[PDB]
Every structure is written in C-alpha cells, then in structure tokens.
Amino acid sequence: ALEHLKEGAPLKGLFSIEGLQKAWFDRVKYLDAKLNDCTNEAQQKPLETLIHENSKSASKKHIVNYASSLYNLKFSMSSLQGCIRTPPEECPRLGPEALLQTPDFNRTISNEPLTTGNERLQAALISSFGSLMEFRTLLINSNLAISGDGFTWLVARRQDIEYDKLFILNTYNAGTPFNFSTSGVMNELNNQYTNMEKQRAKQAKTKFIYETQQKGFSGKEVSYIPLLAIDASPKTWLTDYGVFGKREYLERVWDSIEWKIVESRLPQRT
Amino acid sequence: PYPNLIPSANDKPYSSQELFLRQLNHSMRTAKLGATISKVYYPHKDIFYPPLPENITVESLMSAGVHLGQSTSLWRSSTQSYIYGEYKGIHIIDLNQTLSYLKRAAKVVEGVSESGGIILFLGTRQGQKRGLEEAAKKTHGYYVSTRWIPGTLTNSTEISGIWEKQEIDSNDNPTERALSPNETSKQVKPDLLVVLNPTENRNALLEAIKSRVPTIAIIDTDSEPSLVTYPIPGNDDSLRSVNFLLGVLARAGQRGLQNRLARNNE
Amino acid sequence: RPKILVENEIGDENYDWSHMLQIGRPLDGESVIQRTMYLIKTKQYGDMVEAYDHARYEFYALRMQEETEQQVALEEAEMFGSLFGVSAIEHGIQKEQEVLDVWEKKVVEETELMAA
Amino acid sequence: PPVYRLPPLPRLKVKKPIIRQEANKCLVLMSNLLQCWSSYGHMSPKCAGLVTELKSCTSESALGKRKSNINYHAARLYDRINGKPHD
Amino acid sequence: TLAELLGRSRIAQVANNHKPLTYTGKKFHPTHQIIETKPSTLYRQEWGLKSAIPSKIKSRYLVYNDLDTLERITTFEPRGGTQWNRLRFQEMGVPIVSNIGRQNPFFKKFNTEIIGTGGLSYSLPGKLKNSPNGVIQRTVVPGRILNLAAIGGFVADVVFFQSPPSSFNSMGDFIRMKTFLFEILEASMEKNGSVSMHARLLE
Amino acid sequence: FVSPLPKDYVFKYSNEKLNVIEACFNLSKNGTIEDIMNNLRQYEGSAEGKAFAQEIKTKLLTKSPSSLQIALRLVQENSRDHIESAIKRDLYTAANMCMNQDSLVEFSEATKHKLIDKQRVPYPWTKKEQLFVSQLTSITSPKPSLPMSLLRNTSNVTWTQYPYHSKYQLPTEQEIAAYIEKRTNKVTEREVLNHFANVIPSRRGKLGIQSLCKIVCERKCEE
Amino acid sequence: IHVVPKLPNSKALLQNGVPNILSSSGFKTVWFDYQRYLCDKLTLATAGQSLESYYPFHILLKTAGNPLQSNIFNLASSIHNNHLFVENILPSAKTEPSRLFLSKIKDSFNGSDWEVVKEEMIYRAENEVLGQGWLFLVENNEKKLFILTSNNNGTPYYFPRNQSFDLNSAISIDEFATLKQMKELIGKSTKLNGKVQDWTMPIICVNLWDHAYLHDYGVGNRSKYVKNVLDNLNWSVVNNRIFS
Ligand SMILES: [Mg+2]
C-alpha cells in the first residue's frame, strides 16, 4: 500500500529485511484476507467510513475491528521514515540489564519538528504539553505502558476542520482514535437494559454520571483528528529488538518520525 | 486422611469441605508456581532454621537489629566498652564484639548440652514464648515465659516440690521406673540459665549467682553486664533480634546434643 | 510512600550505582542519594550539589514512567471489562461516612445538653 | 517550653479519677420544662408534650438510668515513664 | 566497616525529624515518613525499629519520631493517611500544572523549597483517558460540602450555576452527610505546598 | 574471633590447576628440577590447566636452577627426617651458600642485584647445569673445617612431625582419605562433611572446612 | 526478589525447545527471556512493598480488587499464567488424558467428544481474543468444566478480573447484561476491600501471547499453534490439577 517501504530493502533505522516483513507485509495480508472473508464485498473504499457505518453493532463488529487494525498500522507507518542509527541486525539484542537503565527523555531531546521546518506544529505541541521533552515523555512512556496489542495516538480536539487543543491517547487491540463513533454506546446499552427491566435512583445517577463524562464544555459531542500513531504490539518489535528492547524500539521510532506529514495533518487553529 | 468427609453427589456441586480440600490441593501443587522468591526475610524461618554460630556475620546481626542499643538517656555506663557509637539518639552496640560474645555463649551452650546438663531459657517479654519453647524442644531443655516465681532455685523445695521428676538414659529415654520419695524431693538445678531480658528479671540472675549456676544474657545498652557469666551485647527489646540470638543458641545446643547421642551410640 | 524497615539479608545485596534502578531495592530518595554518592566517588560530577541534581533528574523520569504505567494498566483493565468493586476514593468516602454518622448522633446529644 | 521533672515518688496516682459521664435525660427534661414555665405564664399548652415526656422518664424512678481505669495505668507505667537513673 | 553498613541501612534511610505527631494546625503535605510492616512481621510485633511495638496496634502502617525516648517508649502514631490522599489524587487524575508561566521543574547552594509538586503527582498534563463509554472529558468525583468541599482527601474551592436551596437549606450545617458529585476543573500548587483544587457541583 | 569469608570469595587454585600441580611436582626418590620441567612440557589435559602449567614452567625457567635443585634435594630429606636435624641441614646449606668453595651458587651477587641495587629486572645467571648427587649432598652437609651448632633451647626436644599443628588447622587431604578408607572398612560426601564439621571436637567451628572437604571429594573420590 | 523457577531437563529444553510445538528459540522467547523479564518487572514494582514476600498467585489474589496497582496484578497474572502454560507443555518431569477428566468433559459439554471440545476451544480462541491473551479450560464450584478466554493478563481464578471480552470494540446486549449482573454481584459482596468469593481453577491454560507462537508460526497461524499445543501437552500435570 505505502510507497516509502518495500519488500526487499526496509528502513535503515528501525526494521530488518525479515523483521520488517513480519511486522508489516504479513500482518496487512492477514488482515485484508480476514476482512474479505467476513464481508462479501471486495471494494476497499475508505476504512474510516466503513468503521463509522458498522460501529455500535455486535453482528458487524469483527469487520470493524479488522478495519481499525488495518487503518491504525497504516497510520503508524505513514509517520515513520529512515534514521541515523545502525540496523538491529548488526547490533546486539538487549538483555535483562535494559530494564534497569534510566531513561534520558527527561534530560535529552532529539529530532524536533523545528529542524525540518514544522514551526507552527511545534508551537502547538508546546502549547498543549508545556514543552517538546514533556510531550515525548508522555508519548513514549504511555506506549511502553500499553504492554500488549495497542496504539498510542497524537490527536487534535475537533470542536475548515478547526481544532481547539492537541492531546494524546492510548487505544487497545482495535480501538478507534475517533470519539464520536463510539461515544455513548455504553450509556445506550444501559438505557436499553433499564427499559427491559421496566418491561419485565442508583441507575439514574449512573446514567447522569455517564452523560457528564461524555458531554464536552459546550458542543453536543467531541471528536479527535489523529496526527500521529505509534504501535505498541509485540508483533512489530519482538522480531528485531527481542523481549527487552521495547523502549529502544520506541526511541528509534521517535528518532525516525517524518514530522512534515504530521504538520500537514494538523489543521488550522481557532 | 479425612475419614469423616461426606462427599457430595456427582450431579450436585462440590460441598464446602470438598471445596476446601480442592483448594488445599491446589495450594500444595500449583499456587506457589509462577516464581520463586530468593533473598527475603520470613520471621518464622529464624526459629525453625537458625544459622550455626560459625556462619553468622556482622551483616546478619545488623539485619536482625541486634546493633540497636537502648537510648542515649537510658545509659548504664558500665556497658561503655560494648557500644560502637551513638546515632539517631540511640547507642549502637559494637557488633564484632557482639559476634565474639555470641560465639563464646554458643560454645558453652553446646558444651553443657553435650555433658547432658539442664538448660533453662528464661524470656518474660510478650512475643518471646513460642521461640523460647522451640529452643527448649531443640535441645532437651526447659523454658519459662510466664513469670519466674522468686526462689525457684534458692527455695526449690517449697516452689518446685509437687512436680514430677523422671529418669533418663545416656540417651533421652524415660526408662520409667518409680522414683523414691527421698529421690524425688531433691532440687534439680539448671546447669545453664539463659535469659532474654536480664533487666526485667534481675531476681532470676541473683539466685543463679547465689545458686552457683553459670548464666547467659542479652545485655542491652542499659543492662549491667557483670550480673552474669557470659553476656551477649545486643538489642533485647526487638523480638526478632532476640529470636535470632536465641535460635542460634538453640542450634548450638542442638548440635552438642546430637554429638552426645552419637557418642552414646558408639 | 510507605517504607518497610524490616531488613532482608544486608550481606546478600550487590548494587552497582551506575544506575538508580536496583532489583531488591525500590525507587526512593535513598536510591537517589546512593547515586549521588557514587557520582561523587567516581568524580563524574566533582561537585556534590551537581551530582545530587543529576540523581534527582534520573529519579524524576523513572517516577513519571511508573506513574504512566499504572494509569495505562488501569485504562486497559477498564477497556477489557475488568470490574473493581471499591475504588480508593469510594473507600475514602465510605470511611468518612461512618465517622460523620458517629459525629451526628453525638452532636445532637450535645445540642440537647446545651439547650437544657 | 519549660518542662517540669518530678522527683522519685512512692506512687503516681490521681486521688479521684473523673469518669465524666453524660448528664441525665430526665434532669434535662425537667430543666427544659422549668425554662418553658419561666416564659408563657404558669402552665400553658406550649409545654404539653414536654411534661408528658418528663412523666414518662420519671415513672419507675426519679432518675432514668442508674469507672475509668486510669490509676491502674499510672501505677502500671510509673516505673517505665520515670526518667529514674539506673540502679 | 560496620559504620558504613549502618549509614546505608534502613533506619539511617529514614530522615530524622522532631516535628509534632499531633499538629492541629494547617496540614498542606505529609510531615513524617510513613512506615509499613508486612502482616507476618506485624504478627510478631516487629517493625524494623529499636524495640517491639505494642500488640494493641493492629494497623500495618505508622509514623514515628524517636526510636527510643527517656520515657522508655518509642514516640509513634499508628496512621498512614497521607499515602491514601496521594492515591485518591492519582485516581482523580487531574494533573497538577503551575498556573504561573514556568517550565516543569522535573525537566531541564541547596534550595529547601518544594521542587514543583512534592511528589504527589508525577503525571503529565497532555493525556486523555479513554473508556468503554468513551473519552472522559469531565472528571466525575464524589465529595462532601462543608458549609469549600472535601473531595477525596483534599479540600477544594467550589463553583456552580445556581446555589441549590432544596439540598442546602433543608440541612444547613449537616451538608457533610450528603455526598455530592463534582467536576474537578484544574489543580494548581502554591509556594507553601498546598494543592489548590477547583471543583464544580453537579446535579 | 574469626569471621566467615565474603560471598564473592573464590579459592584461587582451581581444581584443574591443583591436578596439574599434583601430576608435575610429585617425584620419585631421585627426582630433579629438570624432570619436573619435562613433566610440565609433556602434560596433557584441560586447555586452561595446560596454559597454567606452561606459565609455571616459564617462571621456573626465569628463576635460578642451582638453588631450585638444592631446594628439591632438601625437601625430600626434610620430609623423611625429624625437625632438629632438618634445621641443622638447612643451617649447613646456608653456610655453604655464604662461603661457596666450589663456586656453584651465585647467591651474593644475585642478592645485590635484587635487594641492594634495583627491584626491577631478573638476574642473568652464570651457572646452568645438572649437578651430581654427591655434589648436592656436599653442598647441603657439614664438614670438620667449620664448627656448627644451634643455640640450646629450654625445651631441648626433637620430633619427626608437629605435635600441635594437625589439631588447629584445616585437615589435610591425606587425613580425609584415611577417614574414607576407615569408613569403607556405604560412604557419602554429606556424611564426611558432618564428621569433619561436627564430630571432631577440635575442628567443629573451622571456617572454610566444609568447602575444603567438598573440593577434596571433587578432586579424588568418585560416586 | 522474584526469580524464574528451574524447569526439569532445562539443558535439554535449551538445546531443543519442545519436540512438536515450540522451537529452541521460540521456547527461549516465551520462557527463558520473557518470563525472566516479567519477574524482573514484578520485582521492580514490588521491591519495598509488603508484596515482596508473597508468591505471584497470592499477589494477584491480593491485588485483584484494587483499581490502582493494576500493573502489579497484570505482571503477577502473566507470571503465573505463563508458568501454568509451560507446565502444561512440558514433555516430562507417553501419558494419556485421565478417565475421570473425560467423564467430567462429557458431563459438561452435552456428552461431546474430547476432539470436539478441543475444536470448540480453538474456535473460541480464534473468535474472542484479538491481539494478546490467554485460553483456559477451567473448572468451577459446580463440577462441570468450561472454556475461558482472557484478553491479555486476565486471570481464570477471579471473575471480575477474567478480562474475558473487549469493550474497546462494540459488544452485544447479552454480554452487557452479563457484565451488569457481575457488577451487581460485586456490589452485593459487602466488604471493605470489596472482593467476591470465587473457586474457578484452571485445568488447561494456553498462552495466546505473541511471545510463544510468533517466532515459529509467524503473525498468522496462532490457531494452528493452539491446536498443536492441545495435541501435545503434559496430561499427567492436567490430571493432577483436576480432582478435589
Ligand atoms: Mg532493654
């Protein structure tokens, strides 16, 4: 699907000739085939649109999950680029000592947006997070914490396609980064359950709590424009970096982000 | 095992007792599974697996808390030689010294056990009882947790008059013959009084020295060290440090008992 | 942050203070201080204050990482249908409630006393 | 502040440990009634329920319902709590 | 040497202080190091201190000043409430940020003043928290109104659209009984080390 | 007053090194330094042990040959004989070294080179050949030319082996072997350790005795 | 400090792996490295706490009810679950499944065959868990067995932390109702910690994490891996962890 990566020669920074394939080319194939098996239609269309159509539905759930999985990976890979560091095939794999190493995210900073233009994006990040280093710590640490199949998302709060404020969120297995598609499904289910019970307070209080959790400061609902995705699953990093080198992998990813794409994704501010 | 267990019917679920048994079985086989936990202190392990006098270090003593003496304001200056320095408003007991005295004490404990002497472990503080009883069991010895009635040795005939005496082999077999009433009424004096709180039972120490019995004591930084034959400088207040010293002593006495049994067998 | 003072074998340990995170030891101010001392010894930072600052900065990152770990673990649990019967804040509220009930009955009695 | 250390005493004890109980309900009711009768003339029906309550309280006996181990602790803990120098 | 071991060891690690255990004044942060036991060690009265601690204490946590005093008793108080306040704060998940335009102190002779927060929160402000129901915009927390509102081990300033008479005026000075929900807006931290929260009453 | 050894303690002389020493340095009635050197050269076994053997051969080469030969001659005789006689013999050989008539022990010059002049650099040596047995005897024996005598003690006693060493040190391999033989006329390692660490009253609290016994068992006996 | 336990015939395992299901490298990835890593993490979490003394299973049981300190629970759960999985795998320490076990299965699954049950389990594994997880065959206080999937570090033992289905994706009405019922049951417990009673025991744990299969089987073929595991597992161990 993507241009920047290929089957013969992967990125010099992150992945290796075999490890890249295991991470990306095979996974994508598995997902697409699965999606085809689920749905008789072979038309790809947009993935996001399909998700929106089939969300809040247990029967049309698997397909949605597979769309999310495909989309998220693609989003992650678009952001990535080459790097200065040596390939993991040359380097030795990290042992149990990697756990005890102090992280340098607090003290050091590298590969900022400023170095390749992207000034307004950097300013927006700073406004959101206090600084670049703080943002980085938020991102990488969050990704480490996920511990399983998941994705860390840099997002923008959609209220032209205007935005209010940048944010970051984690999402797991095949969770979407878009709030509007899944906002209030649980509340609806609760309401249905209450209706069923009636047919056959605390519940009212719980509903009220749910409502106040959901609803924003003004608008009827809220949505998030994704700017950056970073995968957290063993699928990618176990091949090259082993068990102990998740943090190292994340560092490498961070070094090799193409910030121009992220900047382009970022819409105009209010 | 479990002869009175009424097992539930196959169509029915588990009974309460049956369920408990299943849980026990799980615990024995597969609960302690995922990992093993090396280098960690279990309190019970000092009573049931104390180290030999040889293998004790200064580090182990420090971990036990033996180094922590009474207080700067509760200082008997008689004990000055034993103390290392002061810190946190507390005198700290020189622990190399403690070690050497402990070894000396341990050796004398072993010796009397080997000779087949009556060792008596005296420990009036609250938590000390169970460990004291264990120590007494380990060597074929004796203990006192409930208070020491003044005059057990000095006034033995009045106090310890109506309790059963026994006979013993070169081994420790009762050889149950009838003791004569003259044979029974004589005092049976200990050959080692070993106390865990000498400051709390001065009295016991005083008859020991009157009754001509060598004695061992955990001398804290407020206790008089001249009041018994073999003082061990250390922290008598904390329960675990006392147990550690006591457990060591028991182990030393146990060894000597084993040696005696071996030489009897020979 | 609660501190266990009951020592495990002091002889058994073997900490290289090249880094803060030792295995048997937890992360705390002590670990920082040990790191500072190590730095002083090695003369990476000749000044004591600078070494202390460095150790503090090492600690902070680790603490932040720890904080993030727990939150994300909680999030994961929430996502995958885990159920926590009593949350910490809920527990606290419950604890307060009993005390308040005790106070109220007493307070009413005291007011009655005062009236008469 | 100025600490005050006592000398060695024979026995630390309070001669009358107060076990400050709550005041009697019947007495309170009687006082309330008295207060009411200070106002509102001699016997107006504003204090109609109060009198009834008092009567109910003081039916079996004039009062309704009929010690602190403090000098069992002092005696116990004197020897500890002393700053008495060693023997 | 022994001296070195002593300096390393867990009693030396507890930084000494003679602050009151009973302080009836304003408490903005922890005074004393909380000290826990394990259950096993509690069972045989051992806390890793100079002496045994009374069998009357059944709580695993405590606070102390002196290992041993002239009165022949360790000066302690069996309570570790400060950890629970911190844990409540963490649960609430409202990240502390300096309202004054300043860099975060954790990033980059001696200053005794509090470096940023005192370490109740090492959380960073930029994150969102998703759930089954969705992305939580407003943090819902139950608290009690005093007259100010007690919200999960912290007192907090409160604001509302209209002052509700039915709940307030029915029980004027027994408002502490009824727990109300709150929407916590933000948490600032002043120079004295007080956490100045700001909540909003929900009905 | 003893203390246990640290947990990072390792006994310098490994098993394979001890084995190679045993192989090489054990000699017959008429053994020599040359014979030892030959043995070292032709030893075969572990690679590390072979390297060790080579190293010790090198350091023997570096040192003086005549002195080594003299030492070799002395040691068997001293093992055979009693203390006082051995001491006398040692005194005689020291005297001979001091006043070398035959001029076959370059000692004083070597001492000057080392102790007096400079710490660095070994002595080149000016005498390297196999001395005869009669010559060796003459070197380590008295004559009527010079009178020789030790100064009289209060306790003028003579014995073949030490009266009080064997009790108050770690027990020799030989003693362990003898014990094993006695036991035979089943046996196991733990039982042996118990016997040595508990039964023997002089050696109950010996510091590194169990470890030593274990090492001995590893080296010699089999399952 | 928590350290990995010594497996029987460890050197042989290192040389080979496991005859049928896992390679030398693949076994190292799942156990000799990953398990160690997990143990280290658990130690780091619970170094100075009271949790240091307890075993992983007992830690998990302690922690389960607490919403915070979920990381500890996750780690402890993983450690225990992974060692159960390894125990199931191991060749020795040929064995057939027990007669009693077969009878219990028959009672549970409407008188179906063991092959059928296996097939149902693999289908469940395929469908239920996305990403990582665990696949247990458990037994509860009602003597019949049942199949239990968990989504990453969900324990089979304690039902509020079964972690049995993903609410990140959309869910059914029936599933929601079940969740609501569970929540109600939890609320009914009435203790200060707020922890229900539960007597679920695992009989056949299987590791649906990528640390087991991904090296050998690739990103696909997790089902195939699961099938292989089911075919070749230590039956004596299973039999031992079955009877009351
Ligand atoms: Mg004392």
Identify the helix (H) or strand (E) that includes residue E156.
strand E155-159
In terms of C-beta density within 10 A (0-12 exposed, 13-18 middle, 19 or more buried), how is residue B131 classed?
buried
In angstroms, the CA F76 to CA F27 distance is: 9
Q: Which residue has the tokens 């006192």?
A: B144
In angstroms, the CA A78 to CA A231 distance is: 12
* B134 CB-side CA count, 13 A: 18
Choose among A232, B31, E90, C73: nearest CA to G74.
C73
Instruction: State the sign of the Cα–Cα–Cα–Cα dihedral E77, E79, E80, E81.
Output: negative
> By the 8 A CB rule, do A111 and A132 touch?
no
The Å distance, Cα A167 to ligand 1 centre, comes to: 61
CA G213 from centroid of its chain's CA atoms: 15
Q: How many CB atoms lie within 10 A of CB A95?
A: 14
In angstroms, the CA G32 to CA G11 distance is: 11
Q: How many CB atoms lie within 10 A of CB G46?
A: 24
In angstroms, the CA E53 to CA E46 distance is: 7
Give every CB contact of residue C92 below 8 A, 6+ residues apart in sequence: E84, E88, E152, E153
DSSP state of B3: T
Q: For chain F, what percentages of helix, strand and coil (3-state, to nearest 5) are there?
A: 55, 0, 45
Beta bridge mates, E179: E144
Choose among F108, F110, F112: nearest CA to F123.
F110
Q: How many CB atoms lie within 10 A of CB F166?
A: 13
Q: Per-residue b/e over D15-54, b at no fewer than 16 CB within 10 Å?
A: eeeeeeeeeebbbbbbebbeebbeeeeeeeeebeebbeeb
DSSP helix/strand/coil, E140: strand
In angstroms, the CA G75 to CA G36 distance is: 11
> By the 8 A CB rule, do C77 and A170 touch?
no
Q: Which residue of B has its CA nearest to E5?
A: B59
Give every CB contact of residue F59 below 8 A, 6+ residues apart in sequence: none
Choose among E87, B32, B61, C66: nearest CA to G53.
B32
In angstroms, the CA A16 to CA A29 distance is: 19
The Å distance, Cα B66 to ligand 1 centre, comes to: 12
Q: Which residue of A has its CA nearest to G178?
A: A193
> Which pair of structure tokens corresponds to residue F86?
């051995």
Q: Could you list which residues have their CB under 5 Å from ion ligand 1?
A: B 220, 236-237
Q: Which residue has the tokens 């303690």?
A: F9
Distance from CA of G17 to the nearest CA of C (A): 29
Substitution target from A32, A35, A66, A173 for chain G, most G beta carbons within 10 A: A173
Tell me the chain F residues in contact with residue B259 when contact means C-beta distances shorter than 8 Å. 198-199
> Which pair of structure tokens corresponds to residue A66?
């597979």
DSSP state of A114: G
Identify the helix (H) or strand (E) that includes residue A155.
strand A150-158
The Å distance, Cα B77 to ligand 1 centre, comes to: 14
Residue B265 forms contact with F (CB below 8 Å): no
Choose among G183, E144, E89: nearest CA to C88.
E89
Q: Per-residue b/e over G52-65, b at no fewer than 16 CB within 10 Å?
A: bbbbbbbbbbbbbb
In angstroms, the CA B218 to CA G36 distance is: 44
In angstroms, the CA G67 to CA C106 distance is: 35
DSSP helix/strand/coil, E188: strand
For G183-216, give the DSSP string.
Answer: HHHHHHT--SS-------EEEEEEE-SHHHHHHH
Q: Which residue has the tokens 């179906």?
A: G112
In angstroms, the CA G242 to CA B22 distance is: 9
DSSP state of F152: P
Give every CB contact of residue B263 below 8 A, 6+ residues apart in sequence: none
Identify the helix (H) or strand (E) that includes residue E182.
strand E179-189
Choose among G75, C75, G148, G137: nearest CA to A173.
C75
Choose among G207, G184, G8: nearest CA to G91.
G8
> By the 8 A CB rule, do F34 and F18 touch?
no
In angstroms, the CA G101 to CA G118 distance is: 14
Kindly give the pairing relationship between strand A150-158 and strand A223-231.
antiparallel
> Which pair of structure tokens corresponds to residue C57?
């900065």
Number of residues assigned to chain D: 87
In angstroms, the CA A44 to CA A1 distance is: 12
DSSP helix/strand/coil, F83: helix
Q: Which residue of G has its CA nearest to C95?
A: G192
- The C-alpha angle C96, C100, C103, rounded to 5 degrees, equals 140
CA distances for A106 relative to A77, A133, A134, C22, E116, angstroms: 26, 7, 7, 20, 15
Kindly give the pairing relationship between strand E61-66 and strand E35-36.
antiparallel
In angstroms, the CA F34 to CA D56 distance is: 124
CA distances for G8 relative to A233, B162, G26, G89, G154, angstroms: 31, 60, 18, 12, 27
**For chain C, how far is it from start to end, CA to CA, in angstroms?**
49
Q: For chain C, what percentages of helix, strand and coil (3-state, to nearest 5) are there?
A: 65, 0, 35
Choose among A238, A239, B34: nearest CA to G85.
B34
> By the 8 A CB rule, do B101 and B230 touch?
yes
Question: Dmax over Cα atoms in chain A, in whole Å?
Answer: 67
> By the 8 A CB rule, do B233 and B93 touch?
yes
Interchain proximity G47–C87, CB inside 8 Å: no
Interchain proximity C57–A107, CB inside 8 Å: yes
Interchain proximity A61–G130, CB inside 8 Å: no
DSSP helix/strand/coil, B218: strand
Torsions phi, psi of A167, nearest 5?
-150, 175
Q: Which residue has the tokens 């009351």?
A: G244
CA distances for G74 relative to D36, E57, E161, G77, G150, angstroms: 69, 32, 43, 5, 12
Q: How many CB atoms lie within 10 A of CB F88?
A: 16
In angstroms, the CA A178 to CA A186 distance is: 16
Q: Which residue has the tokens 């670049």?
A: A132
> By the 8 A CB rule, do B67 and B61 touch?
yes
In angstroms, the CA B216 to CA B197 distance is: 10
Nearest to A141 among C20, C64, C79 (CB): C64
Q: Per-residue b/e over E66-102, b at no fewer than 16 CB within 10 Å?
A: bbbbbbbebebeeebebebbbbbbbbbbbbbbeeeee
DSSP state of A257: B
Choose among C87, B120, F210, F81: nearest CA to E153.
C87
In angstroms, the CA B15 to CA B13 distance is: 7
CA distances for C5 relative to E48, E68, F204, G49, G69, angstroms: 5, 16, 35, 10, 22
Give every CB contact of residue D23 below 8 A, 6+ residues apart in sequence: C113
Residue C79 forms contact with E (CB below 8 Å): yes
Q: Cα torsion at E88, E92, E96, E99 (round to 10°)?
A: -130
Give every CB contact of residue E53 below 8 A, 6+ residues apart in sequence: E45, E46, E47, E62, E74, E76
Instruction: State the sign of the Cα–Cα–Cα–Cα dihedral A105, A108, A110, A114.
Output: positive
Number of residues assigned to chain F: 223
Q: How many CB atoms lie within 10 A of CB F55?
A: 12
Nearest to G33 among A56, A58, A242 (CB): A242
In angstroms, the CA F180 to CA A206 distance is: 81
In angstroms, the CA B119 to CA B109 distance is: 8
Q: Which residue has the tokens 């064995």?
A: G95
Choose among C34, C35, C26: nearest CA to C3.
C26
Cite the DSSP H helix spans in B80-170: 95-115, 129-138, 156-159
Residue E17 forms contact with B (CB below 8 Å): no
Instruction: State the sign of the Cα–Cα–Cα–Cα dihedral A188, A191, A196, A197.
Output: positive
Give every CB contact of residue D21 below 8 A, 6+ residues apart in sequence: none
> By the 8 A CB rule, do F205 and B256 touch?
no
DSSP helix/strand/coil, E69: coil
Q: Which of residues 182-211 of G touch B (CB under 8 A)?
A: 199, 201
CA distances for F81 relative to B152, F73, F77, F88, F157, angstroms: 63, 13, 6, 11, 14
> By the 8 A CB rule, do G130 and A65 touch?
yes
Kindly give the pairing relationship between strand E155-159 and strand G134-139.
unpaired
Q: Which of residues 14-73 of D touch C (CB under 8 A)?
A: 22-23, 27-29, 31-32, 35
Choose among E141, E127, E133, E150: nearest CA to E184.
E141
Give every CB contact of residue G40 below 8 A, 6+ residues apart in sequence: A96, A99, C23, G2
Give the full edge-to-edge strand order of the sheet including E61-66: E35-36, E61-66, E75-77
Number of residues assigned to chain C: 116
In terms of C-beta density within 10 A (0-12 exposed, 13-18 middle, 19 or more buried), how is residue B226 classed?
exposed
Distance from CA of E172 to the nearest CA of A (A): 24
Torsions phi, psi of G222, nearest 5?
-65, -45
The Å distance, Cα G73 to ligand 1 centre, comes to: 42
Tell me the chain E residues in contact with residue D83 when contact means C-beta distances shorter than 8 Å. 70-71
> By the 8 A CB rule, do C56 and C33 touch?
no
CA distances for G240 relative to E199, G92, G97, G203, angstroms: 57, 14, 11, 9
In angstroms, the CA E194 to CA A94 distance is: 43
> By the 8 A CB rule, do F77 and F30 touch?
no
> Which pair of structure tokens corresponds to residue C62?
């680790």
Choose among G167, E128, C89: nearest CA to A187.
G167
Question: Dmax over Cα atoms in chain G, in whole Å?
Answer: 53
Give every CB contact of residue A2 below 8 A, 6+ residues apart in sequence: A74, A77, A78
Give every CB contact of residue B55 below 8 A, 6+ residues apart in sequence: F4
